[PDB]
Amino acid sequence: LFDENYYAKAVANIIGEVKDPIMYKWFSPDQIEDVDLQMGYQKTVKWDAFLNANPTTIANEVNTISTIGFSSEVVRLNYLKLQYKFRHLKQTSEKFYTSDSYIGDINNNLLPFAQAYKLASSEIIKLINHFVLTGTVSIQKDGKNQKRLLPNMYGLLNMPEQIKEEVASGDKDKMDKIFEKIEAGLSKLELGDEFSTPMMVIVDPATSLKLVKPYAAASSCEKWEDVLIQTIKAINNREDVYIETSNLLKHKILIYPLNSELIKFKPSKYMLPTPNEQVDKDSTDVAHSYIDFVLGGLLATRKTILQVNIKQS
């Protein structure tokens, strides 16, 4: 195949230079499991019991007994298939553009297939990372004009039925007020039985700067970062606490465990960018290729993620 398809040969020789996604740092090796799907849905069933009423006293003879009911809940995860197209130079037409310093038409912004494929893949991976972290797909800096996605497709920030706290506008610079909301949210967490697991925190760079101020006079050898780590260590049964900073976030603080039993990521095995076989060709030197990817697969339990919004206004 590599003999016949140059593009397949080009991708294989350049696929190794594509850097890994940064979203891997937000999970654990056991928290990611591959599924064999491109578009569609997967379903799981969970059973829960409940008590209808107070117990019944066993005295003398009695026939009417209190009852215990059962229920089932089905969680469906949706997977969507997306694709991008890019323009490159024809394979045979490169030699007429191989300048002394570089290969490609600098005046018309045309590149060989290999370099075009690498840069396009890098951009898509950035888009994938943004979606998993935030749950939305967009390219504007304001976050508007979002691509409407199917239901049951959510990210760590937009996942419903979690603990949500909102710092008022007037207290955006008051770190004590910020920590007050964090502590209120941390109390409202419901890790339950699963608490002896490492925890992960993600903050915006502006927040990370605030975390190194002395704790409030001022407490020597005590900083807001250290206070936060201790506070989280209270509920995680003295486990490891990791802190991460992401430029993607903005005035958001995200805390969630690294337990596979509470939050599990089941992405498609074809989620990462992949070349398509169809290559547009013409009489000219400009050709087109297609790269497709798959989105979705974040499963999590209710009330297991802390989401803090610092309102600016």
């Binding site: 195949l1 294989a12 890994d20 990791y242 074809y270 992949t274």
Partner: peptide
């Protein structure tokens, strides 16, 4: 490794991604 067709080439890509992710976590120390 010689891919017979495009389908096998796609499968090799998916395995390479999975192996790279596995290698990343092994080398990660946190």
């Amino acid at each position: 490794f010689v891919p017979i067709n495009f389908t096998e080439f796609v499968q090799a890509i998916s395995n390479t991604y999975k192996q790279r992710r596995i290698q990343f976590y092994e080398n990660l120390k946190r």
